[PDB]
UniProtKB/Swiss-Prot annotation, chain A:
It comes from Crimean-Congo hemorrhagic fever virus (strain Nigeria/IbAr10200/1970). Classified as His(+) endonuclease since it has a histidine upstream of the active site that coordinates the first cation. Changing residue 39 to A: Almost complete loss of OTU proteolytic activity. Unable to block RIG-I-mediated gene activation. This is RNA-directed RNA polymerase L. Changing residue 39 to A: Loss of deubiquitinating and deISGylase activities.
Amino acid sequence: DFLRSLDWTQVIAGQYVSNPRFNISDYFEIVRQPGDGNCFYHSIAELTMPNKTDHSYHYIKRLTESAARKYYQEEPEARLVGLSLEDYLKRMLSDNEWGSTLEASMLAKEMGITIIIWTVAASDEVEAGIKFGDGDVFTAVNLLHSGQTHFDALRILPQFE
Amino acid sequence: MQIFVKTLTGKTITLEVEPSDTIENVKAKIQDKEGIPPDQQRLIFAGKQLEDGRTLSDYNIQKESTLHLVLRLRG
């Protein structure tokens, strides 16, 4: 019921924002990811890959590379970054290099899925969501962005199905 | 002239701007009022991300227009 009531504003085509307020653990289980620079990709792999391991994220980075080749040139967020495609890739593919909303938008299109990033205040309550794709929250790969500096993976609690 | 900027949390601030202000200028005003670095700002109007070297005028942004500020999030 609460999850189906979220008000998504489509700010730019394929990208949506919402500012509901809730306790992450009221609706999701948090699956913690290591703090090694790679946790964005760890978190995607936890939700998308079978028999995920601490090595699974390499494949996600490799899909992000494939994704970038197709989509980097029309991604609005790439305008912040200001790199050529080949320089972007070299830095993206680097060890411990943080992933971001840029990779999320590109991966969403490449994997044909919806990715939501839930960002929480210092208080731990959610204060925003950004959604990449047209799917709803029940369909999506949900991530938790906390301390403004870390990603973890989220699974919808069994009672909300 | 006054315009409105709605941030990621739905918080809506006022800025005093001029039609000849660049997008870069508007970001610096957002930073001074809200403490958000220009590097993480995506300013968005009427469905499109605005470009740094253009002006509010270039996009026909007028008195009491609303912009969306979406942040680039790294982790």
